[PDB]
Amino acid sequence: KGEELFTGVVPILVELDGDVNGHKFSVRGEGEGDATIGKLTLKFISTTGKLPVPWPTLVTTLLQCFARYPDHMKQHDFFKSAMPEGYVQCRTISFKDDGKYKTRAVVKFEGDTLVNRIELKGTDFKEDGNILGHKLEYNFNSENVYITADKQKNGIKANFTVRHNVEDGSVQLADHYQQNTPIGDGPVLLPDNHYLSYQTVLSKDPNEKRDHMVLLEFVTAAGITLG
C-alpha cells in the first residue's frame, strides 16, 4: 500500500533549519522523485544568505523512500512501507578531527507532496577547520549505505562514511549513524541486511542568485540475490 504511492513522479518539499556552533541558517528545497528508476532531482536554496557550512556536508541530510528496490527485494523496503504516515530519520554525523551534526527529520506525505522537515544541530566544530572554514570541494563521492533491521525499535539502522574532498587534496571523513522509525502504528516491512548504492551529482543553476545547490541522485537497493 505504501509502495503504491511511488508508482509515478512525486513532488518533494524539503525544509531544513540549521544551527552549527551557534551560526543559524535555513534551507528550502523542492523537486521530484521517481522511485521507479530510483531518481531524485532537487534544488535547495539558502533563505538566510551564504551558508556557514559547505553544501556538500548537507547532501545526506537534505528521501530514501525514492530508492529503486528490485522486484525480488521489494519486501525489504522499509521506507515506502511506512508511508503515507511517514517516518522519523535521525542521524549523528561525526566529522573526523572536527565537530558533529545531529539531525532529526520527519518524512511524510502532505496530500500528494512528500515533505522532509529537518532540524540540524552542529557542535564542537573548529572555526578554522574544513567545515566552518569552507575548505571542501563542491563535489560528492557516492558509495553504499548499509542497512540493517532494528526489530526492538520497529525500524532500521544505517551506517556509512562520506569522504569529502578537501581543497588541498586531503579527504574529510564524515561518519554517519542513522536510525529510522515509523510514525504510524501499523506493521512495516523490516529488511534483511542489504545496501543502497548511490550515484550523486551536484551542480548549479546559472540563473539562481541565492546561495544554492542542485542535487541529482540515483539510488538502487542491492545485496539480496535475485537467484
Cell numbers standing for residue 50: 551564504
123 within some domain = yes
194 within some domain = yes
Preceding amide of 52 cis, omega within 30 = no
Burial 40-64 (b: 16+ CB within 10 A, else e): bbbbbbbebeebbbbbbbbbbbbbb
Experimental method: X-ray
Q: Which residue range is the domain that position 208 belongs to?
A: 3-222
Instruction: Report how many domains make up the chain.
Output: 1
Nearest Cα to Cα of residue 42 among 54, 59, 25, 57: 59
Nearest Cα to Cα of residue 199 among 214, 220, 171: 220
Cα 29 from Cα 32, distance rounded (Å) = 10
By DSSP bridging, strand 10-20 and strand 113-123 are parallel
Q: What is the CATH number of the domain that holds 184?
A: 2.40.155.10
Query: Could you tell me if 195 and 133 are in contact, meaning their C-beta atoms sit under 8 angstroms apart?
Result: no
58 within some domain = yes
214 within some domain = yes
Query: Could you tell me if 32 and 9 are in contact, meaning their C-beta atoms sit under 8 angstroms apart?
Result: yes
227 within some domain = no
Cα–Cα distances in Å, from 168 out to 58, 137, 172?
21, 9, 11
Query: Could you tell me if 126 and 132 are in contact, meaning their C-beta atoms sit under 8 angstroms apart?
Result: yes
76 within some domain = yes
User: Bridge partners of 27?
Assistant: 16, 46
Q: Give one word for 223, left, alpha or beta, with left for phi > 0 and alpha for psi -120 to 50.
A: left
Cα 90 from Cα 3, distance rounded (Å) = 22
What resolution (Å)? Answer: 1.8
122 within some domain = yes
176 within some domain = yes
